Amino acid sequence: GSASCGVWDEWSPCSVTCGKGTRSRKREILHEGCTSEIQEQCEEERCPP
């Protein structure tokens, strides 16, 4: 069948530390044919003008 190939670790800081950018994390993949790093839009606040 198929599986998650592991689970993720703790997140990293955002690229702008304000909300209009992205954050990332790494993991210990169970097999060589799986994604080991990802990104998403962060949850920070109060960006500059």
Q: Tell me the two tokens of residue 33.
A: 């044919």
Strand partners, 34: none
Give the determination technique: NMR
Spatial distance between the Cα atoms of 37 and 13, rounded to a whole number of angstroms = 14
DSSP type of residue 13: P
Residue-wise over 4-40: b if at least 16 C-beta within 10 A, else e?
eeeeeeeeeebeeeeeeeebeeebeeeeeeeeeeeee
Spatial distance between the Cα atoms of 24 and 38, rounded to a whole number of angstroms = 6
